[PDB]
Amino acid sequence: KISSPTETERCIESLIA
Protein backbone atom coordinates (compact mmCIF):
# COMPACT_ATOMS: atom_id res chain seq x y z
CA LYS A 1 0.00 0.00 0.00
CA ILE A 2 2.84 2.44 -0.82
CA SER A 3 0.49 4.37 -3.18
CA SER A 4 3.42 6.21 -4.89
CA PRO A 5 2.03 9.59 -6.07
CA THR A 6 4.68 9.74 -8.87
CA GLU A 7 2.43 10.61 -11.87
CA THR A 8 5.57 11.29 -14.00
CA GLU A 9 5.93 7.51 -14.67
CA ARG A 10 2.35 7.51 -16.09
CA CYS A 11 2.68 10.64 -18.29
CA ILE A 12 6.16 9.61 -19.55
CA GLU A 13 4.87 6.11 -20.47
CA SER A 14 1.76 7.69 -22.09
CA LEU A 15 4.10 9.48 -24.56
CA ILE A 16 6.31 6.36 -24.93
CA ALA A 17 3.26 4.22 -25.89
Side-chain angles (χ1 to χ4, degrees):
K1 60 122 150 164
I2 196 76
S3 235
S4 203
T6 37
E7 279 132 272
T8 308
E9 68 115 287
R10 278 265 192 280
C11 196
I12 280 278
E13 271 278 86
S14 92
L15 296 162
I16 286 168

